[PDB]
């Protein structure tokens, strides 16, 4: 046969790897994430693209930042929905208006303007049932808010007095802590952001008018955000993006992710630079990893660290290149006129000599490093040591079907 594993053994190994990739790796709220997304800014956020990790579960926290468990309800805080007459002199600058050429957190932080007058409560509490944009007869698209009957009735009664006054759509504002004794725990003040500023002029109470918009064709995202801001009950942020809070612990996770992704693309190499057939060429690697995770859980005596994970890169590395050393050996020598008649027995006698040397070359560094190094080096060489002893025997015996695999078929030059 071309495969050198017996058939029930090969099935049995194939069962084993597919069953194994279920382990550990597995893990309206989602329309109000745009509003929740402006509150994450102010912390150094280069690109504030917001994402759900479940139906009611929203994921967006920054890279590496000190503890956010203090900030959960601060960041989740809602507005009172108090809407009251103000005066914006001259500029007519407002936070969602500022977002139209696209938005940036310092430009957004410094977005907004002084209000010269800022008093006289017209609408308060729940009172919005909708918001939407409509083309209108002003040449430039118009955003509208749809108000409830009781709210409508209040606006309807006080229309004629207020007609021409600036009227404030108001959501939360940040505020300096009183004590100033730690990072990221300053409470929000619930009705001091002028998100949009617009003037009363509706003769219809249940329909309120919000300033028209300069978006080139887009308008639904901006449309949704106003009713997202009003109809949101608090969202407390969760989970992480691989990247995520706590810098030194984030390194570990964003390196462990890296050894899984690194592994995955190493297989894509195999697929990309060589002829596919069965799972033969992938087979000794999956058995090496398993024995590595096996020996380590039988021996829980250390502690995890990114120097460990670097040993995990180092020990991944020997595993991937050792497979490459035996594949390219057999073809190239077959190509250069090395025997066909005596092939498999001579591939047993000479195809494994650089597989040994690499593994020995790898081991003596690891041994010397463990003895003489401090700190990370011990961390690094320990995880490696088991893996390098493990990989060598896995490969010398376990990569042997490779020799039959690539002496097969056309005897033409490879």
């Amino acid at each position: 046969m071309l495969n050198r594993y017996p058939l029930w053994k090969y099935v049995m190994l194939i069962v084993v790897i597919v069953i194994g990739l279920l382990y550990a790796l597995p893990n309206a709220v989602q329309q109000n994430i745009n509003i929740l997304r402006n509150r994450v800014n102010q912390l150094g956020v280069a690109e504030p693209v917001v994402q759900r990790q479940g139906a009611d579960r929203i994921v967006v926290e920054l890279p590496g930042i000190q503890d956010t468990a203090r900030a959960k309800e601060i960041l989740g805080a809602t507005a009172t929905l108090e809407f009251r007459l103000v005066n914006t002199n001259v500029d007519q600058a407002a936070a969602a208006s500022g977002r139209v050429p696209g938005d940036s957190e310092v430009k957004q932080t410094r977005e907004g303007q002084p209000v010269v007058l800022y008093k006289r409560v017209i609408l308060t509490g729940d009172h919005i049932t909708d918001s939407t944009s409509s083309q209108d007869e002003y040449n430039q698209p118009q955003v509208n808010i749809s108000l409830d009957s009781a709210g409508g009735n209040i606006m309807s009664n006080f229309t004629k007095d207020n007609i021409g006054k600036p009227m404030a759509t108001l959501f939360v504002e940040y505020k300096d802590s009183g004590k100033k004794d730690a990072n990221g725990r300053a409470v929000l003040v619930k009705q001091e952001e002028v998100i949009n500023i617009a003037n009363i002029q509706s003769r219809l109470g249940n329909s309120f008018r919000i300033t028209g918009i300069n978006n080139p064709n887009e308008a639904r995202q901006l449309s949704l955000l106003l009713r997202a801001g009003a109809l949101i009950a608090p969202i407390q942020i969760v989970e992480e993006r691989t990247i995520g809070p706590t810098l030194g612990m984030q390194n570990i996770e964003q390196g462990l992710e890296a050894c899984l992704a690194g592994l995955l693309v190493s297989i894509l190499f195999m697929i990309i630079f060589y002829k596919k057939f069965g799972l033969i060429a992938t087979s000794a690697l999956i058995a090496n990893l398993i024995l590595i995770v096996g020996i380590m859980s039988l021996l829980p005596g250390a502690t995890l660290s990114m120097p460990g994970i670097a040993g995990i890169v180092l020990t991944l590395a020997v595993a991937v290149d050792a497979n490459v050393l035996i594949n390219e050996r057999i073809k190239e020598e077959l190509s250069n006129g090395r025997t066909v008649q005596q092939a498999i027995d001579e591939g047993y006698r000479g195809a494994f000599s650089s597989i040994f040397d690499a593994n020995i070359t790898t081991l003596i560094k690891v041994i010397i490093l463990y003895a003489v190094g401090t700190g990370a080096i011990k961390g690094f060489a320990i995880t490696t040591g088991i893996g390098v002893a493990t990989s060598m025997f896995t490969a010398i015996v376990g990569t042997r079907a490779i020799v039959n695999l690539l002496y097969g078929g056309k005897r033409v030059k490879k």
């Binding site: 887009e218 639904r220 995202q221 949704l224």
Partner: protein
């Protein structure tokens, strides 16, 4: 070179094309129906094919953008 020099070609071509046109009729309704039919079907074949793919994905971008 390649300007207003190199004869004899353009004027000869014009009388050539007029005289390939000449000895026969230039149109006929049903032969027009066959070429429009293959043409139509080939447009329809594409249109059903991206009707079950991009036309569905772009419905959402109408709705949410």
């Amino acid at each position: 070179t390649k300007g207003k020099a190199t004869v004899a070609f353009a004027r000869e071509a014009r009388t050539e094309v007029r005289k390939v046109i000449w000895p026969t009729r230039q149109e006929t309704l049903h032969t027009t129906l066959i070429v429009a039919a293959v043409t139509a079907v080939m447009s329809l074949i594409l249109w059903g094919l991206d009707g079950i793919l991009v036309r569905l994905v772009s419905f959402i971008t109408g709705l949410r953008f």
